[PDB]
Structure prediction request, 390 residues.
Amino acid sequence: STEAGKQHSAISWGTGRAVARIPRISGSGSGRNGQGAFGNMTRKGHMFSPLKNF
Amino acid sequence: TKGTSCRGTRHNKTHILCKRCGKRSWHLQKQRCASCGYPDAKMRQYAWGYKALRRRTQGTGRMRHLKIALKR
Amino acid sequence: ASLKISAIKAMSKNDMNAKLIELKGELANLRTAKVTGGAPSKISRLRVVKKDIARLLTVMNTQRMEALRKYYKQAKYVPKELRPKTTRKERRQLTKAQLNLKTVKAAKKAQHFPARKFFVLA
Amino acid sequence: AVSNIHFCKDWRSKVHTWFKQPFRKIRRHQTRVEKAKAVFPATIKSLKPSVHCMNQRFNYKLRLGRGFTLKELRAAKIDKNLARTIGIAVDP
Amino acid sequence: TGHKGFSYKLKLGKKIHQNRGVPQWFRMKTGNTINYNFKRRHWNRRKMGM
RNA sequence: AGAUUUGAGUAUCGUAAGAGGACUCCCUUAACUUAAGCAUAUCAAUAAGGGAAGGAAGAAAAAAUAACAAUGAUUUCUUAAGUAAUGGCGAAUGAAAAAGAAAAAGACCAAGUUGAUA
RNA sequence: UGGAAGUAUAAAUCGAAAAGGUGAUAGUAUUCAUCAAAGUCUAAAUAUUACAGGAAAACUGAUAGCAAAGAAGUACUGUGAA
RNA sequence: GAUUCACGCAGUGUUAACGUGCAAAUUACUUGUCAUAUUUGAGUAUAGGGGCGAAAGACUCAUCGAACUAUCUAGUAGCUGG
RNA sequence: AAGGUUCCUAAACAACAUUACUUGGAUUAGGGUGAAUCGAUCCUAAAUUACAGAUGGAAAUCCUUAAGAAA
RNA sequence: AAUAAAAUAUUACUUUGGAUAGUUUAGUUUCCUGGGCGAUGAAGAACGCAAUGAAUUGCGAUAAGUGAUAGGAACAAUAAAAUGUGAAUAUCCAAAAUUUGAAUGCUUGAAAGUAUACUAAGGUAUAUAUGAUAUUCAAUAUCCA
Prediction:
C-alpha cells in the first residue's frame, strides 16, 4: 500500500529528553502514543524502499 | 500556580452533545458544532483530515435504505 | 405462532378488529403474568401471541392497500405511495418516446434514405 | 554526458501503466465481432479515397483518406445521398 | 446535577444499562470467547465525558 | 367605465437543496525544495480552500494545417521529442503539423423567405 | 504560454465593416494560398486506488500484511479540532 | 481612595521544610494586606503577524520573542550517529 | 456547578484503598427519585441569529428594522 | 595456613517469557462487470426491540422479526411451545418503517414545547427560491369614456 506505515502525524521529540530522535507518535491515552514512527527500522512503520506496482 | 492549583475551577462545560453527529462537540457560546459542522447545511469535511473522513461517512453506519437500493 | 393465514383471510373486517382487541388484551395479561412470576408455558405463550398481532395486522393492512390500488388504478392523480417503484433519477429521465423523438425533416429523410443491406464481392 | 532528466515534478502521480493492454485486445476484438454480427455491412469500414501524403518528405506515397469529394461521386455517377447508405465515405 | 434535560437524563440511563457484565448462559455457548465486557467503566475510574 | 403594461398574494401540479467526489470541468497569483547563498526562475494547475457533474465527463464538424504528386470534425495510443523554442540563456522548463493505428456521424437555431398569416 | 517586437484569458479606455481572419519577426504595399469567427447539440474509440460484486498472484504469514485475522476506527486521551 | 484587628488573600524573609515531594510550585513560621482603583459567581464579547496587557514580551487550557492541531512532508542538511 | 447510581439493603472478599480487613465511595443481585402551589417552561439584560436587501471570484460577510407590497 | 556459607563454571529437570517451527475464515496489488442514493425524506446520529443479553449482529411500537414465493426436517447454553396441515434457510417482492438529520410551520442547549386548517386523542398540510395554469388585487405606468 502506498500509504502503509505513513498514516501518522508523528514528529520527533528532539534532543534533551534522553530518547532517540526517531519520530514519535503524538497524543496520549494509548500504548501507541510516544512510540516509534514512520522510520524504516521501527515497528509498524514503512519498510525500506516500498515495492511499487510499476 | 499555572499547573495543579489552576485546575480547581474547571466546572463549566464548553462543548455539549451535538444533535446531528452525536459527539460532544457543540460549542455553546459559538453555537456551532466543531466536528460535523452544525447548522451549516453541508457536513464539515476537510481534505487535510483524511482520517476524519473514514471515521464518519457513507457505509460507516446502518445504511438502512441505501443497502436495499444498491443491492437492487 | 398459532393463528393461521387461512383463518385470518376468511374473517371479515369487523372480526379482524374484534380479534385484534382480544389479542392485544390477551397479550397485556401475559405481560402481567411474566412480571408476577409466571410459568414457562405462559411465557412461551407470550412469544406466540406477539406473532399473531404482527400476522393479523399485516393482512388487514395488505388488504386495505390492495383495495386502494384498485380505486386509484384509473385515477389521474395517483397518490405517491401507490405510484410505480422507481428511483429519483429514473423519474427525472426523459421517456423512451421523448428520447427517440425526431424532427419531421430528419424522420422523413431516414424513411427515404435508410441503411441498405449489401456486401462486397472478393 | 550532461543529464537532462525531468523528474523534479511528482512523476509518481504522472505514471501511467499499461496493465490493461492485453484486455483492450479482447474488448476491441469482441466488440469488432459483435458489430459484424449485428449488421455486417456496417463493420465493412466504408470505402475511402486514395490520397497522397502531405509534404515533400512523403508526397510519393498513397494513403487512405476520409471521404470522396462531391466531384468524384459525380464522375463515378453516384448520388451523394445514396453513397452514405452503401458504405461509401463522403467528405464535402 | 440535580437539574437535567429530559434527553440528557435518558442518555445517562443508557450508560447505566450498558455497564453490565456477560450473563452466565451466554458464557456457556459453544465456541464462546466473550467472557468479560471490555467496554465497562466505573464512576471513580473513568469519566464518561458527557 | 373600458382596452393594455408591469408587479404582487393565494390555490394546484412539479422542480432545486443534502450524501459521494477514485476518474471529469473549473476558480485561486502557497510555501518547503532546487539554484550548493538569493531576490526572477523551479517546486507548480502542485498542497490546502471553493464550485459543478456522469457512468463516464471534457472536446467535436475549420475564420484548421500546410507550401506538398497536398490534406480535411473531435477523442485516445506510437513517433516526432528532451527536438524548435523558453530561461539571472543559469538551475531548469518544453510543444505541434506531417506520418502509423483504435473508432468513425452528422445535424440544428439566429438571420433570409411564405404571409385571407397561427 | 515553448510561442520569442505578445500564444491565451481578464480588467480600464477605445471600438469596425459595401465583410473579413490566418500563413507565429514589428511595419506599409502588391500578388498568392487557405478558411469564413463572435449561438447550440452530437454516439464510438479514452480515464477510474470512491463504492459493490467476482477472478487471479515467483505479494505478507500475527513486531509481517490495511491502523484493524476476536464486540477495530474498538479500548483509551483531550474543552475541542483531533 | 485616614490608622489597625478578624473571616479571607497574597507571597517579603527563613534564600527553613520537601526537592525520585502532600504538590509537574506545595507546607510551616515570619511578613504584608484584608470594601470603593475592593473581593467574588454565572452569562456574554475579543482569536493567531490576531486578541488582551496599571507594560513583565506578560497572558491567550502545565504549550507564547508568535498557541494547539492536521496537510504540503519521508521538508533540506557541505553536519553527528549507524 | 461538576460527577452519574457512587444512594438503601442482602450475599459475598479473587483483585483495589503502600500491613491486614469480617470494613468500603470495591464484587454480585435486587430496590429506590411521586408537585396545580419548589424550579425549568413565561419575560427581557449584556449579547445572539433568521427570510428578503446590500457586498463578495468564492466560501461567506454585513444589516436586526434600516433598505421590504415582510415583520 | 584453612573454610566452602556466599561466588563462579558445565549438564539434566522445573519455573518467568513467548522466540522458533507448523498453520490461516485476514490483508496487499492488478484485472473484469457495474458505478444502480435523496422532499416518494437520503447518508449520518440517537433511542428502543430476544424467555433468560452487557457488547456485537439483525430489526423498528407488526421489534434477533410479519406476509408472499422458493425451500424441504431442524435449533440448542438451558428450558418451553410450535412443526410434513410445512422447522430452519433465501429474497432487487408486499405490508410496515420510533426521535432526528438537506430537515422543510415556529422554537430547539442537554428543549421540556407549541400555532392554524382538514379528517377529544390520532394522522396529514403549511420553510426558502422557483416554472406553468387559475383566481383575487395594486399602480392614471400607457391609452382612454
Observations:
- The longest helix of chain B spans residues 50-55.
